[PDB]
Amino acid sequence: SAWEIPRESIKLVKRLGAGQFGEVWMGYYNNSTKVAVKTLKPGTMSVQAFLEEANLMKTLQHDKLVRLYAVVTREEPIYIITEYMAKGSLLDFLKSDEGGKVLLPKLIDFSAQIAEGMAYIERKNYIHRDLRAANVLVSESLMCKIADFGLARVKFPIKWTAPEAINFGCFTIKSDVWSFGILLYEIVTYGKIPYPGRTNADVMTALSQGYRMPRVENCPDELYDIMKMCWKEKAEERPTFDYLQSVLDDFYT
């Protein structure tokens, strides 16, 4: 409760997204600092549960993770206040015309930035569980930060979820690596959806047969190798994020 602040020192301006659990707004703190405000629509979700995301964020702080600044909990609609990212999700950015212009070099940069943030998560013995392009935000400076920690721990995105997780509820840091490989596919394709023209049900079935997404026309052999490292059936045999950052950094040069 040192993160509590008066509702008066927050003005909402533009709505960014609208979910069933509420909305997200760009706003200002004390008229000076622009911020993002996550709104809890009461009824759809319990207060205590909605806040556990923020509670988790007090613990986790890193430059590749979206920083919590404050919260508003005393009155009817509840706010969570974070740093604002000018370009929205990595998915919004890549799909936008500006992101279309961006070419492989920077895509690798984005890749590595994310691996770095995740290397922090593994260092700190956590798991994200919902790691994908929609939950990575982008600043005006073109920096990437991991945003939504709703499912993070000390509904699940089926097409980003590892086979052992789906089959045995076994979510671990290695499951997040799987997801990262899938994130790579999102990046290299400029925001396209994984397993194109397939249902979640299809994918679950296909993964039991040992399916893996074949290489994309763009994706270089040596990057595809990195993706394929992440997608090894046995979780133990997948790399660490530390290692992924390295190889992604050295690919650059």
Ligand SMILES: CCCc1cc(OC2CCNCC2)c2nc(Nc3ccc4cn[nH]c4c3)ncc2c1
């Ligand atoms: C735990 C983190 C909570 C959170 C949640 C957000 O909501 C977004 C989630 C991903 N989908 C869209 C909403 C945030 N959005 C932004 N900026 C933002 C968002 C969307 C757009 C579109 N054009 N420009 C944009 C700028 N900045 C910080 C955010 C923080």
